[PDB]
Write a protein that binds this ligand. Structure first.
Ligand SMILES: COc1cccc(Oc2ccccc2NC(=O)[C@H](CCC(=O)O)NC(=O)c2cccc3ccccc23)c1
Ligand SMILES: COc1cccc(Oc2ccccc2NC(=O)[C@H](CCC(=O)O)NC(=O)c2cccc3ccccc23)c1
Ligand SMILES: COc1cccc(Oc2ccccc2NC(=O)[C@H](CCC(=O)O)NC(=O)c2cccc3ccccc23)c1
Ligand SMILES: COc1cccc(Oc2ccccc2NC(=O)[C@H](CCC(=O)O)NC(=O)c2cccc3ccccc23)c1
Ligand SMILES: COc1cccc(Oc2ccccc2NC(=O)[C@H](CCC(=O)O)NC(=O)c2cccc3ccccc23)c1
Ligand SMILES: COc1cccc(Oc2ccccc2NC(=O)[C@H](CCC(=O)O)NC(=O)c2cccc3ccccc23)c1
Ligand SMILES: [Cl-]
Ligand SMILES: [Cl-]
Ligand SMILES: [Cl-]
Ligand SMILES: [Cl-]
Ligand SMILES: [Cl-]
Ligand SMILES: [Cl-]
Lengths: 240, 236, 234
C-alpha cells in the first residue's frame, strides 16, 4: 500500500498540469525514498524527470516499492476537480487502481476518485551530475514570455551567452537580458539552437517556481529546471 | 400591460437561466404574477417561473394575457442592458422592453404559443437537500468530466458517478447544508440536464434538491422578494 | 529615420486599430509626422492616421520615406510590447526596439506600395461628442439587432428579425450635439471596425453630414488623431 497526504494538493495540480502536454504516461518509481519519474515524449526528443521527496508529504507510507503505470492524461483531468483541497494519494497493494482523495479545508466536502493504472514499467536509467558550460537563472515569467513571444516569429530559438534570437518569414528578432533577478555564469561560451515548440511545453511548469534555471553545454542536452519547494525539482531535457 | 422592475438584473439572470433548456415558452401574464411554465424539446424536464407582482415596483397587467416568447431572441434583447439598468415591459401584440440607467427601447415580436398550463401538486419528498449553489455547481461540473450521470443517495447526501477514466463519489455532511430524509432514496439523474439548471445560480445561493422516488426531482432556485425557479428532472 | 516614442502603448493601440480594417497600408513617413492613408478591401471607408513628430522624444526624418508595411504583421511584431516598453523605429526593412534590463529588438520586412488623396476640411451639419466607450456598446448592443444603424440628429436605430431597437441620448465624459437635422443609415459591421480604436482616447466625435461620408474621429493623446471616413448605405 502507498499513502501520501499533501496539505497543499495545489502542488500535485500544477505538477500534473506541467507535464500533461509533453508526455501522456510514465513509470512512477514510487519508492520509500520518494516519487521519481522518468519519461520521454512520443517523438523521443525530450526527457522529463520529476523528483518528489517523501519529506514534503505530511504523511508518507510505502510498504513495498512499486513502479506505477500512470496515464497522466486521466490523472491531470482528475486533479482538475479540486486549489486548496488536501489531496491524499492512496494505492492499494496489487490493485489496478490509484486512489486520489480530495479533502477540503472545512471537512464539509470530501471527494474520492479512482484511476485505472496501466502496465508501463521501463527501468529508468540515471543521468550524471554533469558540468555545463553556461547556465542562467532568470524569472520563470520572462523565460515564458521570451519563449512565447519569439514563437510567433520562428519555430526555434537561438540561445547564446545572454541573447535569445529567433528568425522567421515575418522577420527576425533578438531578445537580450543582461545581468541584474538574472544571473549568468559562462565558463565556456556556447551557442545552441532549440526548437521552440518543446520549450513552450516546459513553460507549463512555470507556476511551480518563480525562477527557472537553464543549463547548456555542447556535449549534453539543455536542462530547464523548475524547483518544487521542499518536495524536490522538475528537470526538462531538450536536444538541439 | 406594464411592469417596471428596478433590479433589472433579475430579468437578465432569469432569461440566461432558461435560454439553453427551453427556446420558447408561454407567459401567463396575470394580475397576480408573471407565471411561466414550459418544457424542453426532448420532454425530459419542466421549468416553472413565478414572478410575483409584489416584486415589480409598478405592475399594471389588467386583462389577462398569455404571451408566447422566443427566449433566445428575448435573451439577446435582455442581455443588451447592464445589470444596473431599470427595465420596464409593456404590451397591449408585441412585447416592449425599455432600459433606463441614456435610455434605450427595444421591441420583441411575440409569437403564437398558448399551451394551457397544467396544475402541479405539492408532493411529499423522501429526501430534500439545501446546499450552497456553488457547491452544487462544482459538484455537478466536476462529476460530469468523469461521467454523464450522478447518483444522488441520501444518508442522515452523496453524489457519485462512473465513467471511462474512472469512478467518483463526493460526500457532503450536514452557506449551510440540511438533509431532511423521511425515507432514504437513491436516484440517477442526467448531468447534462442538471448543468442547464445550474445556469440559474446567479439568481440566489440557496438551491434545494427536493428528491423522491415516484416523482421527478425538483431543483428549486428562489428569486429574492419575487418568486422562484423550479427545475423538474426525470430519473433514468 | 529614427523616431523614439516613450509612451509605447500608443503605437500598440494604434496598430490594433487599423489591423482589422486595413490589412496593408502605406506609411508616408514624413518630417512633420508619420501619416497613413488607406482604404479597406471593399472601398467603402478610409482611415487617415496622423502622428506628429512633436510627441516622439527624438525624431529624425532626413527624407520622404514611404514605408509599405503590413499592418497585420506589425500588430504581431508589436507583440512582446510591454505597455511601458519604449519603442523606436529605424530606416526595405523596419526595425522596432523595445526597452524596459530586457532590451528586445525586432526587424520587419516591408511591402512595396499607390499614393495619397488630399482630403479637405468639409462642413458637417450635425457633430456629436460622446464618451468613447459608450459609443462601442451602442454599436455592439445594437449590432445584435440589425446590420445597420440609423443615426439621427442623437438617436441610433437598428431593425432586424428579432425586432426594432432604438437608443437615444441628450445634451449634457459628457455629450455635445450641434446646425441642420440629418438621418443617415450606416453600415454597422464597419462601424465596430472603428470602435477598436477606443483604447487611444476617451472622446469620439461622430462628425456627420449629408453630402460627405461620416468621420468618426479619435484623438490620440497629444500625438495626433485617428480619423475614420465611412460612407452611408443606400
Ligand atoms: C535502455 O536504454 C534506453 C534508451 C532510451 C530510453 C529508455 O527508456 C527510458 C529510460 C529512462 C527513462 C525513460 C525511458 N523511456 C520511457 O519512459 C518511454 C516509455 C513511455 C513513457 O514513459 O513515456 N520510452 C520511450 O519513449 C522509447 C521507447 C522505445 C524506444 C525509444 C528510443 C529512444 C527514446 C525513447 C524510446 C532506455
Ligand atoms: C533515457 O534517458 C536519457 C538520458 C540521457 C539522454 C537521453 O536522451 C535524450 C535526452 C534529451 C532529449 C533527447 C534525448 N534522446 C535523443 O536525442 C535520441 C532520440 C533517438 C531518435 O532520434 O530517434 N536518442 C536516444 O534517445 C537514444 C538512442 C539510443 C541509445 C540511447 C542510450 C541512452 C540514452 C538515449 C539513447 C535520454
Ligand atoms: C542527460 O543527457 C545526457 C547526459 C550526458 C551525456 C549524454 O550523451 C552521451 C551519453 C553517453 C555517451 C556520450 C554522450 N555524449 C556524446 O557522445 C556527445 C558528446 C560530444 C562528442 O561527440 O564528443 N554529445 C551528444 O551526443 C549530445 C549532445 C547534446 C544533446 C544530446 C542529446 C541526446 C543525446 C546526445 C546528445 C546525454
Ligand atoms: C395534455 O397534457 C400535457 C402533458 C404534457 C405536456 C403538456 O404540455 C405542456 C403543459 C404545460 C406546460 C407546457 C407544455 N408544453 C410544452 O412545453 C411544449 C410546447 C410549448 C413550449 O415549448 O413551451 N410541448 C411539449 O413539450 C410536448 C408536446 C407534445 C407532447 C408532449 C408530451 C410530454 C411532454 C411534453 C410534450 C400537456
Ligand atoms: C407538463 O408538466 C408536467 C407535469 C408533471 C410531469 C411531467 O412530466 C415530466 C416532468 C419532468 C421531466 C420529464 C417529464 N416527462 C416525462 O417523464 C415523460 C416524457 C419522457 C419521454 O417521452 O421520453 N412523459 C410525459 O411528460 C407525459 C407523457 C404523456 C402524458 C403526460 C401527462 C401529464 C404529464 C406528463 C405526461 C410534466
Ligand atoms: C411534477 O411531475 C409529477 C409530479 C407528481 C406526479 C407525477 O406523475 C403522476 C401524475 C399523475 C398520476 C400519477 C403520477 N405518478 C406516477 O405515475 C408514478 C407514481 C406511481 C403511479 O402512480 O403509478 N411516478 C412516475 O411515473 C414518475 C416517477 C419519477 C419521475 C417522473 C417524471 C415524470 C412523470 C412521472 C414520473 C409527475
Ligand atoms: Cl507519450
Ligand atoms: Cl533538488
Ligand atoms: Cl425548445
Ligand atoms: Cl415562493
Ligand atoms: Cl487591404
Ligand atoms: Cl488634430
Amino acid at each position: 500500500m502507498f499513502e501520501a497526504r499533501l496539505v497543499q494538493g495545489s502542488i500535485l495540480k500544477k505538477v500534473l498540469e506541467a507535464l500533461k502536454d509533453l508526455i501522456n504516461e510514465a513509470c512512477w518509481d514510487i519508492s520509500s525514498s520518494g516519487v521519481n519519474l522518468q519519461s520521454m515524449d512520443s517523438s523521443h526528443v525530450s526527457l522529463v524527470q520529476l523528483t518528489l521527496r517523501s519529506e514534503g508529504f505530511d504523511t508518507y507510507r510505502c510498504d513495498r516499492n512499486l513502479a506505477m503505470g500512470v496515464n497522466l492524461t486521466s490523472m491531470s483531468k482528475i486533479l482538475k476537480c479540486a486549489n486548496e483541497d488536501i489531496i491524499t494519494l492512496r494505492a492499494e497493494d496489487n490493485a489496478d487502481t490509484l486512489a486520489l482523495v480530495f479533502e477540503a479545508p472545512n471537512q464539509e466536502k470530501v471527494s474520492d476518485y479512482e484511476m485505472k493504472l496501466m502496465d508501463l514499467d521501463v527501468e529508468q536509467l540515471g543521468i550524471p551530475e554533469q558540468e555545463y558550460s553556461c547556465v542562467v537563472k532568470m524569472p520563470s515569467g520572462e523565460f515564458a514570455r521570451i519563449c512565447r513571444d519569439l514563437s510567433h516569429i520562428g519555430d526555434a530559438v537561438v540561445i547564446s551567452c545572454v541573447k535569445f534570437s529567433a528568425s522567421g518569414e515575418l522577420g527576425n528578432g533578438n531578445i537580450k537580458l543582461s545581468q541584474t533577478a538574472v544571473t549568468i555564469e559562462m565558463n565556456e561560451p556556447v551557442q545552441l539552437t532549440f526548437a521552440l515548440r518543446y520549450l513552450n511545453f516546459f513553460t507549463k511548469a512555470t507556476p511551480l517556481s518563480s525562477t527557472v534555471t537553464l543549463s547548456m553545454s555542447a556535449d549534453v542536452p539543455l536542462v530547464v529546471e523548475y524547483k518544487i519547494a521542499d518536495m524536490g525539482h522538475l528537470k526538462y531535457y531538450l536536444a538541439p
